[PDB]
């Protein structure tokens, strides 16, 4: 390491000890006399020491090492010992600070190149950073280009700031962020700066605002950690206050701005103000000559006297850049309107004026700050040129105004003048110049997938060119929409560099937004259905962010799925291509939204046994079945009273309901068998509290008197208790609760809190709802927690729970488990955690909520059910919580897996989490034993009339006949159930290693079977973990026990009387089955060992048995053929899947191979062979990159265990682990 970097470390006590006023014997070579006198002339110790430090860092080590050895040696040896050792030891803090400083220097090259330190702004802003608190923020403002970046970077380079920020400072340039979705990109950048870890499965979609809120919450959770507790985050060139609201994180933030409106919005009380426009806060003439001499390197420069010092010289640099070319002379002339950009007009007419003026002015057509291809730049200039394109490009770079990124041969437009003066008269020929622009790709030819198309420009800013054409040409073939454009645009323009992964969704919505302006293409009017699809494309695009930019998939298949009306566009679009398939015309995944007629639900509550009670606007009660499978919906209406419902509570093991209306009446309803008026047991009734230990009711009148009522089971009625009426004398009570069976907490309409001691009756002085679990107070605008502690004076700890701006609370409810609680607001639902006081979740809908309810659930997967009703809507939304996140058929049941396919291929059978068998050709069958809470473990069907099922306790049911087979053989879970012939059945327990064969005897083997087969109607072949066994039906006593092989069988298949077997050590044995009249014999054909390292996961052989293929646990897929008693590798494909291959299947025509894993892949066998039903798959070709990969469909779930095909290989049935269940049909 270098001494200069470590010298900046020892700075504080360096200021305390070193003087620089007592070392004027300083060897003159190290410090020149003029500059050392300048340092000594400084007034205070801190400023002089800082100037000395800067001057020392300016020089090289050939004087730094002399500063070490000499100078201080005469008197400052006491300051040697740390640094005299710190050069060697290099402590961990020193190393971390140096590493961060090097990273910051490498990030900004110009800072290292042409730096200059402004003492006054640097010190002034450093003091604010030192004093700053983890919630406040310091704002620095000034005219555009007043060098706020100078001072910001300079201050952050100081060691004291880094030490106080714990070496955790994150920059963020907030430029071009006036859209609600670029802020999401900036948040992703900040997260990547934090840590490259994010479970992207949280596809919120809907409005992007919800996703930005979710990522804000995630990063807020991630930042409040001890290493990240104090951290500087810097906002650069912030645009509008909206970005600030999207970027306030309760962190040590600081923003630099230039718009005055941001300063107006910013509250100076909570934010310190730093101004660069102050007359004292400006470049001094000494600073003027320092900046001028930074890299001009000339002795006499006094001619630039009275140049724009005000200028942060951001202007000067302009002037200096001219100096590298045009003389200082005529720049004293350039002072005319020096403050205004007329100087920018100069140095351009001074540029060679033959043709370069108009030649450069041609660059106004391009969008600002865009990477311009040089090839297109050739034609945009083809009017004259009269030179070589690269020659004029080189001269353009030479003067000031080209950076010329050569990696992809692209011109870059600078961004300090070309935003201005490019208007002029816009020369002429602008529209025909853009005509040439759209001509160079001749965007009317599209034949197959992606044609020649420039990757960067023509996928990014082509819309700008398309905008400035004739209107008949504007609408006719705008391309864009959806054919192939956005898929390859998303993959190629991917922004995977730092703030995203391979492929994004952003900057295409920002092209489809600002297409919210361009539906003006023909307006809605003509192709108004295209206006509809233009609106819907955002939603479907956010619906499939994941599973699309993770692998080699194309947009077309994932389009051809789904619903709504885009399919009408696909059917027209996709009639000029080969292969292609889906037509997934079925959906059996969950339910939501419950109809409740023309009335609007005021309140909602869930009930046991899957029911819901809705309190309606009309004053009635609607009891409904949530499964949408029952047939009973009851309407409980009070014929005498129609007052609206204000409150209710279900009690008595949810068998009775207590309700309270506006008219001062409280009633009791019986739900599972009589409306009782408890008030009869002119004073109106305001509020109540039901508490259960003895079930008890407390009630408050209008005058404040509180009464106490006891439940009666024998009559199921509320009687008056003998406790005397406490006179609260608090009229206008709005709510009241009992705490610890001793105290009363009362809140009135005037936000007044009172506490009453039931033992003595004394009153203590200290709104929407009050709950006890500490007391939760819910107001319209605020939420309060009141922790209670017992004592002579009751001690209450009040904590505010944060809520979002511009919104108010309507109603709330706490979970039964007391961990989370739900708040309803005009924007939607907020799921809030009590133990962390952070908003965990937000409802997917931006709507005015009028009722909230939560229901704890008993399942390892689903935990809570959420109900919410909307004002002005005739629906009520049902949301389910999974361990917590939104899951987006009863809302508490899901299909697990355990498929079954009939031999004739006419019916498919599935099982759900509630042991119900679903038949799809859709009907539901419930077996009798499901009431015994026995988990469903295996299912097997042969025809539509024989369906058998095995449970976890060794129990066999015939589903259709509801008959149980003899229960005296297997008591363990049944891991396998399948019948091979209409009169035989096999069942096995793997844990007990037991098998039973039923004749539809039964026969018992001490073997565990993973697969069973019948041969010649005589021999039953069983595959075990230890070997293969064969049984004769005619002679069951001749069972052949397996040889005790130490090797487990991992893959196998029996085809064409040839037995393939794979062991864990990557060895295949292939045998030929020879059938004699009295004995089954195995002759060994081959033994061979695989070169692939990974374990074999599945094996499959073709019908003729000539070929085979296996997949491995790492996702590799291998194909071999079997010739000359040898197995030779035919083809290898890697990165097929990231999980182990779950199934492999060969078509009878031998042209196709299906792989079932995290994604379903179709592989072409012919192209597979040539590079060492049939009419449907002939001449089908795949992607150019992977010619053997015909198609691939990604399951929304993590994996799929099994898949089935029909006889014609035209339909494919699949079920992933999440219960979503796919029908994949070939496009006929």
From Swiss-Prot:
The keyword Repeat applies. May be AMPylated on Lys-242. Residues 124-292 form the NB-ARC domain. Disruption phenotype: Pupal lethal. Reduced apoptosis during neuronal development results in central nervous system hyperplasia; a larger number of differentiated neurons survive in late stage embryos and third instar larvae have larger brains. Delayed removal of the larval salivary gland due to defects in induction of apoptosis. Imaginal discs of the eye and wing are enlarged. RNAi-mediated knockdown significantly reduces levels of apoptosis and caspase activity during embryonic development. SUPFAM superfamilies: P-loop containing nucleoside triphosphate hydrolases, WD40 repeat-like. Residues 5-83 form the CARD domain. GO terms for biological process: apoptotic process; autophagic cell death; central nervous system formation; chaeta development; compound eye retinal cell programmed cell death; dendrite morphogenesis; melanization defense response; negative regulation of humoral immune response. Pfam families: APAF1_C, Dark_CARD, Dark_WHD, NB-ARC. GO terms for cellular component: apoptosome. WD repeats lie at residues 640-673, 701-766, 804-842, 1091-1130, 1136-1172. InterPro entries: APAF1_C, Dark_CARD, Dark_WHD, NB-ARC, P-loop_NTPase, WD40/YVTN_repeat-like_dom_sf, WD40_repeat_dom_sf, WD40_rpt. Disulfide bonds: none annotated. Keywords: Apoptosis, Repeat, WD repeat. One of its GO terms (molecular function) is structural molecule activity. Residues 890-1228 are annotated as: beta-propellor 2 (7 WD repeats). Exists as an auto-inhibited monomer; this state is maintained by intramolecular interactions between the NB-ARC and WD repeat domains. In vitro, at high protein concentrations or in the presence of non-physiologically high dATP concentrations, assembles into homooctomeric rings 300A in diameter to form the apoptosome complex; two rings can interact face to face (via CARD domains with some involvement of the WD repeat beta-propellors) to form a double ring structure. The octomeric ring may represent a non-functional or off-pathway conformation. Possesses an N-terminal caspase activation and recruitment domain (CARD). At high protein concentrations in vitro the CARD domain mediates the interaction of two octomeric apoptosome rings to form a double ring structure. This is Apoptosome protein Dark. It comes from Drosophila melanogaster (Fruit fly). The lineage of its organism: Eukaryota, Metazoa, Ecdysozoa, Arthropoda, Hexapoda. The gene is Dark.
């Amino acid at each position: 390491y270098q001494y200069k970097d470590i010298l900046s470390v020892f700075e504080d006590a360096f200021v305390d000890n070193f003087d620089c006023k007592d070392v004027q014997d300083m060897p003159k070579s190290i410090l020149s006399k003029e500059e050392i006198d300048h340092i000594i002339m400084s007034k205070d110790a801190v400023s002089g020491t800082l100037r000395l430090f800067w001057t020392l860092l300016s020089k090289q080590e050939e004087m730094v090492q002399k500063f070490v050895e000499e100078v201080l040696r005469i008197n400052y040896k006491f300051l040697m010992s740390p640094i005299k050792t710190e050069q060697r030891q290099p402590s961990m803090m020193t190393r971390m600070y140096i590493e961060q400083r090097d990273r910051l220097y490498n990030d900004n090259q110009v800072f290292a190149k042409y730096n200059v330190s402004r003492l006054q702004p640097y010190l002034k802003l450093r003091q604010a950073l030192l004093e700053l608190r983890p919630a406040k923020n310091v704002l620095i403002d000034g005219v555009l280009g007043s060098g706020k970046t100078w001072v910001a970077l300079d201050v952050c380079l100081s060691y004291k700031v880094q030490c106080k920020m714990d070496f955790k400072i994150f920059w963020l340039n907030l430029k071009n962020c006036n859209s609600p979705e670029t802020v999401l990109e900036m948040l992703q950048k900040l997260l990547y700066q934090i840590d490259p870890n994010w479970t992207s499965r949280s596809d919120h979609s809907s409005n992007i605002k919800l996703r930005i809120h979710s990522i804000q919450a995630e990063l807020r959770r991630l930042l409040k950690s001890k290493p990240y507790e104090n951290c500087l985050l810097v906002l650069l060139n912030v645009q509008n206050a909206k970005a600030w609201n999207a970027f306030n994180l309760s962190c040590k933030i600081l923003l630099t701005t230039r718009f005055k409106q941001v300063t107006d919005f910013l509250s100076a009380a909570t934010t310190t103000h730093i101004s660069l426009d102050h007359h004292s806060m400006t470049l001094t003439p000494d600073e003027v000559k320092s900046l001028l001499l930074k890299y001009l390197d000339c002795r006499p420069q006094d001619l630039p006297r009275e140049v724009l010092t005000t200028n942060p010289r951001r202007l000067s640099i302009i002037a200096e850049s001219i100096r590298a070319g045009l003389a200082t002379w005529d720049n004293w002339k350039h002072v005319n309107c020096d403050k205004l950009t007329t100087i920018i007009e100069s140095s351009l007419n001074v540029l060679e004026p033959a043709e370069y003026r108009k030649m450069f002015d041609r660059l106004s057509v391009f969008p600002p700050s865009a990477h311009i291809p040089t090839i297109l730049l050739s034609l945009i200039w083809f009017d004259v040129i009269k030179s070589d394109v690269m020659v004029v490009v080189n001269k353009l770079h030479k003067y000031s105004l080209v950076e010329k990124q050569p990696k992809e041969s692209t011109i870059s437009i600078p961004s300090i003048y070309l935003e201005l003066k490019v208007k002029l008269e816009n020369e002429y020929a602008l529209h025909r110049s853009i005509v040439d622009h759209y001509n160079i790709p001749k965007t009317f030819d599209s034949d197959d997938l992606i044609p020649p198309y420039l990757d960067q420009y023509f996928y990014s800013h082509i819309g700008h060119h398309l905008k400035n054409i004739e209107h008949p040409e504007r609408m006719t073939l705008f391309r864009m929409v959806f054919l192939d454009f956005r898929f390859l645009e998303q993959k190629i323009r991917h922004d995977s560099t730092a703030w995203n992964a391979s492929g994004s969704i952003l900057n295409t919505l920002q092209q489809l937004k600002f297409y919210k302006p361009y539906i003006c293409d023909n307006d809605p009017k003509y192709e108004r259905l295209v206006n509809a699809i233009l609106d819907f494309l955002p939603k479907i695009e956010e619906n499939l962010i994941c599973s699309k930019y993770t692998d080699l998939l194309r947009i077309a298949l994932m389009a051809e799925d789904e619903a709504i009306f885009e399919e009408a566009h696909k059917q027209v679009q996709r009639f000029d291509d080969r292969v292609w398939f889906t037509n997934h015309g079925r959906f059996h995944q969950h339910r939501q939204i419950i109809n409740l007629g023309d009335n609007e639900g005021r309140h909602a509550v869930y009930l046991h046994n899957d029911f819901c009670l809705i309190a309606l606007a009309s004053g009635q009660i609607l009891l409904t079945d949530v499964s949408l499978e029952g047939e009973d919906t009851y309407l409980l209406r009070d014929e005498s009273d129609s007052s609206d419902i204000l409150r209710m509570a279900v009690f008595n093991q949810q068998k009775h309901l207590i309700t309270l209306h506006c008219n001062g009446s409280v009633k009791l309803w019986s739900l599972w068998p009589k409306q009782q008026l408890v008030n009869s047991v002119n004073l109106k009734i305001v509020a109540f509290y039901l508490n259960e230990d003895n079930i008890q009711l407390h009630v408050a009148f209008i005058n404040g008197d509180v009464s106490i009522l006891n439940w009666d089971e024998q009559d199921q009625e509320f009687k008056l208790s003998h406790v005397p009426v406490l006179k609260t004398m608090q009229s206008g009570i709005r709510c009241f609760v009992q705490v610890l069976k001793r105290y009363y907490v009362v809140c009135t309409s005037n936000c007044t809190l009172t506490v009453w001691d039931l033992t003595n009756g004394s009153s203590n002085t200290l709104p929407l709802a009050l709950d006890v679990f500490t007391v939760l107070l819910i107001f319209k605008y605020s939420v309060w927690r009141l922790n209670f502690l017992p004592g002579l004076s009751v001690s209450l700890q009040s904590e505010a729970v944060q809520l979002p701006e511009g919104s108010f609370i309507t109603c709330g409810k706490r979970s039964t488990d007391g961990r989370y609680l739900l708040l309803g607001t005009s924007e939607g639902l907020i799921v809030y955690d009590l133990k962390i006081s952070d908003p965990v979740l937000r409802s997917n809908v931006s709507e005015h909520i009028e009722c909230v309810d939560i229901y704890e659930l008993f399942d390892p997967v689903y935990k809570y059910i959420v109900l919410c009703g909307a004002k002005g809507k005739q629906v009520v939304h049902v949301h389910t919580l999974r361990s917590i996140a939104w899951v987006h058929l009863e809302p508490n049941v899901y299909l697990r897996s355990l498929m079954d396919m009939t031999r004739e291929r006419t019916q498919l059978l599935a099982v759900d989490s509630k042991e119900r068998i679903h038949l799809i050709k859709w009907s539901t069958i419930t077996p009798t034993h499901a009431a015994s809470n026995c988990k469903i473990n295996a299912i097997s069907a042969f025809n539509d009339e024989q369906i058998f099922v095995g449970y976890v306790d060794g129990v066999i049911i015939d589903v259709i006949h509801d008959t149980a087979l003899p229960q005296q053989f297997i008591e363990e879970p049944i891991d396998y159930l399948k019948q091979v012939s209409p009169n035989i059945l096999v069942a096995s327990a793997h844990s007990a290693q037991k098998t039973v064969i039923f004749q539809l005897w039964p026969l018992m083997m001490d073997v565990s079977t993973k697969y069973a087969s019948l041969q010649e109607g005589q021999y039953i072949i069983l595959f075990s973990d230890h070997g293969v066994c064969h049984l004769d039906i005619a002679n069951p006593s001749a069972f052949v026990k397996p040889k005790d092989s130490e090797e487990y069988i991992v893959g196998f298949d029996l085809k064409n009387s040839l037995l393939f077997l794979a062991y864990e050590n990557n060895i295949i044995d292939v045998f030929r089955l020879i059938f004699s009249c009295n004995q089954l014999r195995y002759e060994q054909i081959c033994e061979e060992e695989i070169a692939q390292k990974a374990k074999i996961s599945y094996l499959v052989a073709t019908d003729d048995g000539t070929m085979l293929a296996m997949g491995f646990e790492n996702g590799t897929l291998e194909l071999f053929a079997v010739e000359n008693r040898k197995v030779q590798l035919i083809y290898s494909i890697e990165e097929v899947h990231e999980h182990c291959i779950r199934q492999l299947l060969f078509s009878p025509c031998k042209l196709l191979l299906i792989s079932c894993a995290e994604q379903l892949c179709f592989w072409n066998v012919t192209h597979m062979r040539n590079n060492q039903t049939a009419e449907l798959w002939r001449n089908k070709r795949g992607n150019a990159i992977r010619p053997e990969l015909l198609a691939c469909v990604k399951f929304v779930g993590n994996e799929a265990r099994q898949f089935f095909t029909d006889a014609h290989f035209s339909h494919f049935y699949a079920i992933d682990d999440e219960g979503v269940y796919y029908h994949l049909q070939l496009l006929e």
